[PDB]
Design a protein around this nucleic acid. Structure first.
Lengths: 80, 95, 100, 91, 81, 98, 89, 104
DNA sequence: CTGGAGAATCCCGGTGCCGAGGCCGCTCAATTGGTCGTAGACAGCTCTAGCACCGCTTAAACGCACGTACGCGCTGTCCCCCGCGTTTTAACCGCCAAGGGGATTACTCCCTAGTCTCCAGGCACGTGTCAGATATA
DNA sequence: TATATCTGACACGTGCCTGGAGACTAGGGAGTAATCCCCTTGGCGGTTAAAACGCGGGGGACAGCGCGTACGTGCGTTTAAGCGGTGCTAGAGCTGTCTACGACCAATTGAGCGGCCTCGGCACCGGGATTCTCCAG
């Protein structure tokens, strides 16, 4: 796999901004947002895989990412 | 006419803020997740619902960032976001 | 059910057992879970009320996360108590900015 | 497998009898109950621990509720819980 | 009954904290409004703190009370055991 | 001739001074009377540990200072050195206080 | 408190150095802080796998979950070394 | 002390019993206090070393909370691990913005 | 374009002290040595969802020309917050004086875990049905 | 749209079992009383640091206005994402061992705690050199 951070294209980012309520967007915003999102997700994958590898499992379960987000003080609902 | 600047923007904001379906392309997102995930273990096994939950948390986090960023801009007598403004917001957020 | 014996709905036995075996202390007082289920069921009553009002006012018959979303974002207390919460499949409330 | 669906549905029939429910909304509400569950249980545990008590009684729960909920919602919570506990243990 | 002791926290004292806070220039309206912000913040904490004290049914607020209160809002303070 | 300093020398020098020191700034007993005054709304004639009230003063001013840092950043972006009430409203809003 | 142990460490790291009482209290509060962090997060970590015993496995994983990078790495080095040394005895 | 048996310094016994008398889990594995106490001794050594260095950097032999202020706040990893923590009598890190200083 | 006075600060030095670091009894908590029951280590195996590739469908991404609308700098206004001098009290501290409720010890109890049994509530699981899609006249 | 046909997700029904309710014992957490005292509160009284007040007044917040680039948007171009469909298999989860390990009790004992020194790091202080600044050049 290569360069998939650009696969989440600028139009999708615009869709987020419209969902975020934004009228004008600087051209440099998109890559900076990919960076912030990148580090953010790296934090998610890091502790998530730590939970997966700890349990000697090869598959990442939903409950693990719930625990990870909960550790970061951003509780996510939606799983019974 | 040529659909004046701001009308299409405001109506689009109303429509997508009025709806709730997922907005990020699934295969680029999933492959991006696996690609970044390679830096600990290559070829992860993923639940689809996990990928969806990451899309949920991710887009809520980003939209919320647009909310705080936009409020900082409007407060700063601006309506145009800048990367330095986002960096200021995250600094205020503690990042 | 003991809930019906108290005129409630949430399971006094299940909540009582899970709380005692909730690994906080070996023994838990008897009236604490009843009080707990009563408060949560009350919370359940107002949120089901706001959601019902939302579906009814939005011409809907089945409650969906969207009605929960503007239900929370329209209730100051729900926003306050759930300030650290991310709602799956909820979207956001279209809070319209003055300049926008 | 345990869930809280049926009771929330009964309460739904108590408040809005002519309103239905999607499965996803019932699930997300069950997750909400899991959150409230964890917050109250954790805080009540902390409260009992701070004064080194090994039994969680209604007073610790009441005080915890007073700490978490600001004002009138706490007033109604304490009112309903008190009425419920009192009415139950008095019959 | 005592009244307006928040005005005891005076304008130059606000200038002291603000100047240690890195503020260089201060609007005249900042002072009273800032006293209000401080009052709000305290009420967010002192009420819950004294509520911890009231659970023990005591008339003397201990340091542990403010420790638990500050910890409760993620504003941990060290220096008391 | 009138010995007068320029607008900022003594001020910033004082800033550096209290950046070197670590002691509490405002007056103590009037503040403690404010504490008791606000405390009236819960129980009358309360006993207070003085050091706990001092801890309240320390943590409170630490909070205020942090707020001054953030509103200070807001002034920095808005081409100002003067804090305004709406800037405090922005900072507390972004924090999540309203 | 922890004064005597912090002072022992002080003799190991900077023998010609003192410390105020207030700073020692800060250190005691930090020790209690870290203790509740590891104990709570490790406790729920054990709960996740529905285990009733917190072993070296759970503590090690919990440390990498809680501690940032280089400090965690050296913590694993010193910790694993130490557990090896005491456990072999 | 079991620490001395392992050649360490933090009290494995007191902390270990605090794990039993702390309501965290039902049972405690044997290697847990050794590993955990080792982590605290290492990080503690980091803190004391930085405080000692900072104390020497200020012509003082006695460490005061101000040394905790510059030592901790000048360390990125402690600043990030303790981003919501402010200690008593610590003060503020000296930092004046360029736009605030006069332009000499 | 830059130095002169003088307040601020650095530094050198001298004084006092009280807090810090070291000593000295005095317990009781940490360690050992077992023992007991069980959580969990272990081996092998199903199936099923994840993976992986084929193939069709079109939603979605990309590029370009265009204009406006948004940031931003220049330029101008002015009043308000800094600087400093003056008066005033009320902050600060030390001292005097009273006494409550926090901390301790002990009493007395009543409340919850543990055993064991029992059973209907609660979980899984198809079945109807009506909300709503589709065709033709 | 009438009428008639056709679907799918949720309301409603069933069978099976297992988790909670009864009642009792047993031990111990918590309310309660009494009681000492020490820190808490509240006063007197002296000293003086500091807030308040006010008077310039330069400078920073702010507006107007005019310039120009760049980002949005329509419209036309291009396509791999998405769905379905087929096929495979690693590994989640299960099933069946089986015990060494961690809790526990009792006995041991030396580390760690409380009270008590006593002295020197640092606060305070005073005095001179340097540095930095504002206001002269």
């Amino acid at each position: 796999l290569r360069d998939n951070i650009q696969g989440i294209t600028k139009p999708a980012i615009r869709r987020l901004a419209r969902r975020g309520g934004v009228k004008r967007i600087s051209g440099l915003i998109y890559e900076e947002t990919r960076g912030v999102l990148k580090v953010f997700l790296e934090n998610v994958i890091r502790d998530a895989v730590t939970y997966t590898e700890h349990a000697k499992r090869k598959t990442v379960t939903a409950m693990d990412v719930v625990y990870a987000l909960k550790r970061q003080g951003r509780t996510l609902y939606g799983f019974g | 006419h040529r659909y004046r600047p701001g009308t299409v923007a405001l109506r689009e904001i109303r429509r997508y803020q009025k709806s709730t379906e997922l907005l990020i392309r699934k295969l680029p997102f999933q492959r991006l997740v696996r690609e970044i995930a390679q830096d600990f273990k290559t070829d992860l096994r993923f639940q689809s619902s996990a990928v969806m939950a990451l899309q949920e948390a991710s887009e809520a986090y980003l939209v919320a960032l647009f909310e705080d960023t936009n409020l900082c801009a409007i407060h700063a007598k601006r309506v145009t976001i800048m990367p330095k403004d986002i960096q200021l917001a995250r600094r205020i957020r503690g990042e | 059910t003991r809930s019906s014996r108290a005129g409630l709905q949430f399971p006094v036995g299940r909540v009582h057992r899970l709380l005692r075996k909730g690994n906080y202390a070996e023994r838990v007082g008897a009236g604490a879970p009843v009080y707990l289920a009563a408060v949560l069921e009350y919370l359940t009553a107002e949120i089901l009320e706001l959601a019902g009002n939302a579906a009814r006012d939005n011409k809907k018959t089945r409650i969906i996360p969207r009605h929960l979303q503007l239900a929370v974002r329209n209730d100051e207390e729900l926003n306050k108590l759930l300030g650290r919460v991310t709602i799956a499949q909820g979207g956001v409330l279209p809070n319209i900015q003055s300049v926008l | 497998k345990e869930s809280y669906a049926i009771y929330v549905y009964k309460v739904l029939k108590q408040v809005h009898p002519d309103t239905g429910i999607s499965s996803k909304a019932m699930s997300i509400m069950n997750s909400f109950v899991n959150d409230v569950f964890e917050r109250i249980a954790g805080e009540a545990s902390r409260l009992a621990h701070y004064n080194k008590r090994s039994t969680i009684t209604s007073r610790e729960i009441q005080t915890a509720v007073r700490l978490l909920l600001p004002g009138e919602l706490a007033k109604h919570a304490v009112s309903e819980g008190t009425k419920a506990v009192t009415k139950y243990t008095s019959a």
